[PDB]
Amino acid sequence: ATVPDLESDSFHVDWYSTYAELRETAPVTPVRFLGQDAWLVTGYDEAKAALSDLRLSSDPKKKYPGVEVEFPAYLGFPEDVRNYFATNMGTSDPPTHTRLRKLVSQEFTVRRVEAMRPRVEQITAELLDEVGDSGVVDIVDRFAHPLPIKVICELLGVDEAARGAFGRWSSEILVMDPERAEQRGQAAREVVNFILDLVERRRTEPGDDLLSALISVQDDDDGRLSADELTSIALVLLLAGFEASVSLIGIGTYLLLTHPDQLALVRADPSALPNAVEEILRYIAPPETTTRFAAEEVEIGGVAIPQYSTVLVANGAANRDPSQFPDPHRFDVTRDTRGHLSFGQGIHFCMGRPLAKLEGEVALRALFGRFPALSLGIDADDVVWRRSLLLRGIDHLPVRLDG
Ligand code: HEM
Numbered sequence: 001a002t003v004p005d006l007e008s009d010s011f012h013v014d015w016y017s018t019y020a021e022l023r024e025t026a027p028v029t030p031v032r033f034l035g036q037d038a039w040l041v042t043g044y045d046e047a048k049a050a051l052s053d054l055r056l057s058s059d060p061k062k063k064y065p066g067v068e069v070e071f072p073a074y075l076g077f078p079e080d081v082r083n084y085f086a087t088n089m090g091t092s093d094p095p096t097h098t099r100l101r102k103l104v105s106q107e108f109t110v111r112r113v114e115a116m117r118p119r120v121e122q123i124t125a126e127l128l129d130e131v132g133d134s135g136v137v138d139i140v141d142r143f144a145h146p147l148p149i150k151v152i153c154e155l156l157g158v159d160e161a162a163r164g165a166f167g168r169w170s171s172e173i174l175v176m177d178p179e180r181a182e183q184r185g186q187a188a189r190e191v192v193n194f195i196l197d198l199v200e201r202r203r204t205e206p207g208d209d210l211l212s213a214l215i216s217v218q219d220d221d222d223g224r225l226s227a228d229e230l231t232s233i234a235l236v237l238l239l240a241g242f243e244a245s246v247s248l249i250g251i252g253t254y255l256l257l258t259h260p261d262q263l264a265l266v267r268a269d270p271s272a273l274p275n276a277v278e279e280i281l282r283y284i285a286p287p288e289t290t291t292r293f294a295a296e297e298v299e300i301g302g303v304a305i306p307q308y309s310t311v312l313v314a315n316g317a318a319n320r321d322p323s324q325f326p327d328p329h330r331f332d333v334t335r336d337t338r339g340h341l342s343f344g345q346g347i348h349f350c351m352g353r354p355l356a357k358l359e360g361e362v363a364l365r366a367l368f369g370r371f372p373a374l375s376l377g378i379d380a381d382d383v384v385w386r387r388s389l390l391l392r393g394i395d396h397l398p399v400r401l402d403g
Pocket residue numbers: 058089090091101236237238240241244245248281285286287290291315341342343344345347348349350351352353355356
């Protein structure tokens with residue numbers, strides 16, 4: 001047989017056409033990625049089933065007798081830094097996942113997120129004040145990127161001289177290219193060091209930020225976060241804030257720009273924006289694939305996935321399955337986006353959803369409300385998509401402001 005290589009351009013060039021080809025053939029198929037065998041789930045019901053099946057583990061630290069598996073997200077990571085990237089919610093199974101998420105939810109609340117709205121709006125304004133009212137700028141470098149970064153650094157207590165460097169490290173981590181495994185491995189060690197110092201300074205000089213809060217947080221029955229847990233959680237929260245929202249803002253900007261009809265609806269009806277963000281996420285989900293490990297043999301969509309297999313649930317392909325979303329290839333701000341898998345499903349549902357939504361809505365609202373003539377600086381076909389199945393995105397998007 002012929003087995004798909006997730007590394008081929010087929011998974012980075014007009015890739016939603018490949019996903020449809022696979023899904024129509026077999027919703028759960030064996031593939032190859034980074035020179036390793038895995039199972040790609042492209043169908044909606046299959047993705048949902050897999051995400052809900054706890055026999056499919058999210059913990060990369062677990063050792064199985066005779067099995068030695070290296071999951072793609074940890075390409076080139078030395079075991080010690082891997083552990084630092086994997087001692088948090090998303091890399092745990094119950095009951096560890098349960099308490100870690102419980103303790104963090106006590107401080108990472110909707111109240112804390114909502115309380116930052118004026119600041120998020122203030123930051124958005126300033127950024128837009130300095131881009132100009134005429135010419136072609138890189139809306140990603142000048143807007144989509146700095147906004148999320150300033151927000152997360154304030155939430156976490158990351159100073160000005162720290163950002164930027166950290167940024168080039170997380171960008172490297174986003175690519176899983178076997179030829180750069182060393183460089184990727186190095187950037188991961190830098191991020192881990194950075195975080196170690198951040199937490200150390202924070203313990204020494206307390207404040208009212210989220211990190212300070214996580215350090216003192218404790219529960220009667222669950223106790224507190226150990227040093228390692230605290231470190232890994234911080235690294236993971238900082239990582240998400242630095243990259244997740246950028247993809248949303250940038251992709252969102254590109255979609256509204258390429259869909260005048262949809263944009264106009266938003267402009268006319270501001271109350272339409274919240275669901276517009278939901279459609280953007282469903283259309284081109286940043287976390288294209290999520291990973292699971294079959295601790296036991298599991299049957300998904302009529303296919304038995306052998307024990308000790310690595311499953312790549314393609315959240316993005318699932319969002320374009322006609323059985324769930326009719327005319328999935330149609331970007332429609334009015335569509336019923338209920339049930340999409342861009343924020344996860346089950347126990348690992350994205351806990352940063354409130355923050356992502358706030359930043360996304362405020363940003364696009366300001367961008368488009370401020371520049372009623374905003375247009376794309378390049379040919380839509382010439383847009384370069386980041387080659388990452390971990391977090392899809394656009395690193396450079398030239399837009400013309402005045403016309
Ligand atoms: C557009 C933005 C975002 C998208 C599309 C997104 C997507 C996801 C997905 C798909 C998962 C589930 C992973 C899995 O099932 O393996 C997840 C988990 C998570 N996300 Fe996000 N996320 C976004 C923003 C953020 C932000 C901004 C934060 C935090 C500051 C965040 C923090 C997390 C955390 C901590 C988890 C793990 C939850 C758990 O395992 O219980 N995410 N996110």
